[PDB]
Design a protein around this ligand. Structure first.
Ligand SMILES: [Zn+2]
Ligand SMILES: [Zn+2]
Ligand SMILES: [Zn+2]
Ligand SMILES: [Zn+2]
Ligand SMILES: [Zn+2]
Ligand SMILES: [Zn+2]
Lengths: 221, 214
């Protein structure tokens, strides 16, 4: 299989430095190159630099030339991008991409590395099950919730029934307030499914190595 | 630097309709223009390279055209899976330049939200906080307002709202609204209400509960 695989999410302090990696596997011999891209807020993309003999060697966008350093382990085809003088504006998803020469195009992209630049403290989330209001069910369908409150930094992942319950799931983007994120998820199933069958929300917060399961239980008096 | 101007920034389009996105470079870029699609949480994917060259694995309804400074991407017949963001790219000279992007959203019939309200969990109460959560699921269009009321009185402080992207399976939107109170402020009041104002109803859709009723 031909692919680019980037290293995992980061939290780094203002004024420190970070080094992310991108491993290429399965590519034909004698075609190594790598390009690096930044995308803030899931929106605009900009190019940092590249290593590509067919495009003139190692080169940087003037904007990033001071802070960025691109290297490569040629034996393992692993690219590295080191960034220093980190500021909050460097908080972004960083992509690697590899040019495929025939015409040419950027045929392969890494999955992206999320980097958060902040002095705020890592904080594991509280995870709360949300059962419907106390009382008899009114309707043929029921909606349950999971609340993931007060964590830092991103990301978190959430599933229902370890991923086997996927349709009817709405997981909402996290919202940041006072250096803490809050996220929620709703799931909707037929009344004859719950509480007859077990429904659990599973939450992982990688920064704190947290993995938590909260079963949704009918409320009491 | 070579600058790029992409339009429109967003657009609503029906299934089966002809979609055109345009891109203007600040100089002749000799057709070194590529088009990309990007879905939420995913990496960009090339649709077209050298302005009009097509790729295996990209459906034939995508095509590109132009030369000099002016380029366009065409979707001859929109399909559900085409929902997402689109970017042009000049690669005549490095540093390469992406356009600012086009958000493509799909038209559907109007739909009223399904509203559900959730009292604080016993776990959070034992920890000393009290969040009240309201889900507004599967509505259209995107424009919606949520109001919280406590004992009949509107509350604006302590509210966090979050919207999903356009639903990839029914083209609706959903939003979550969380009203966070202290446990003792929660215990000083009886009725908690979230109401949704939307195009689909002249009157708000109201979900409420009482802190002790069952
Ligand atoms: Zn694989
Ligand atoms: Zn360093
Ligand atoms: Zn078709
Ligand atoms: Zn009211
Ligand atoms: Zn949905
Ligand atoms: Zn009060």
């Amino acid at each position: 299989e031909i692919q680019l695989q980037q290293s995992g999410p980061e939290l780094v302090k203002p004024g420190a430095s970070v080094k992310v990696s991108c491993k290429a596997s399965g590519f034909p011999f004698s075609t190594y190159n790598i390009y690096w891209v930044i995308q803030s807020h899931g929106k605009s993309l900009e190019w940092i630099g590249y290593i590509d003999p067919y495009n003139g060697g190692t080169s940087y966008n003037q904007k990033f030339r001071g802070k960025a350093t691109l290297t490569v382990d040629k034996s393992s085809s692993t690219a590295y991008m080191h960034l220093n003088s980190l500021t909050s504006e460097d908080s972004a998803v960083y992509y690697c991409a590899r040019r495929w020469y025939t015409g040419d195009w950027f045929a392969y992209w890494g999955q992206g590395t999320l980097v958060t630049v902040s002095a705020a403290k890592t904080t594991a989330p509280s995870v709360y099950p949300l059962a419907p209001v106390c009382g008899d069910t009114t309707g043929s369908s029921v909606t349950l919730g999971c609340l993931v409150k007060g964590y830092f930094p991103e990301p978190v992942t959430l599933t229902w029934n370890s991923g086997s319950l996927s349709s009817g799931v709405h997981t909402f983007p996290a919202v940041l307030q006072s250096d803490l994120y809050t996220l929620s998820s709703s799931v909707t199933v037929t009344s004859s499914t719950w509480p007859s069958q077990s429904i659990t929300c599973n939450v992982a917060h990688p920064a704190s190595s947290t993995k938590v399961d909260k079963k949704i239980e009918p409320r009491g008096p | 630097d070579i600058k790029m101007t992409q339009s429109p920034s967003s657009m609503y389009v029906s299934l089966g309709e002809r979609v055109t996105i345009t891109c203007k470079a600040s100089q002749d870029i000799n057709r070194y223009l590529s088009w990309f699609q990007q879905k939420p949480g995913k990496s960009p994917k090339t649709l077209i390279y050298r302005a009009n060259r097509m790729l295996d694995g990209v459906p034939s309804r995508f095509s590109g055209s132009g030369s000099g400074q002016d380029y366009s991407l065409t979707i001859s017949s929109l399909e559900y899976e085409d929902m997402g963001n689109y970017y042009c790219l000049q690669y005549d000279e490095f540093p390469f330049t992406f356009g600012s992007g086009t958000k493509l959203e799909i038209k559907r019939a109007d739909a009223a939200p399904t509203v559900s309200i959730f009292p604080p969990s016993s776990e959070q109460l034992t920890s000393g906080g009290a969040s009240v959560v309201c889900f507004l699921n599967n509505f259209y269009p995107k424009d919606i307002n949520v109001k919280w009321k406590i004992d009949g009185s509107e509350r604006q402080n302590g509210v966090l709202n979050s919207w999903t992207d356009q639903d990839s399976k029914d083209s609706t939107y959903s939003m979550s609204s969380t009203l966070t109170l202290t446990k003792d402020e929660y215990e000083r009041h009886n009725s908690y209400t979230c109401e949704a104002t939307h195009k689909t109803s002249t009157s708000p859709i109201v979900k409420s509960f009482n802190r002790n009723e069952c």
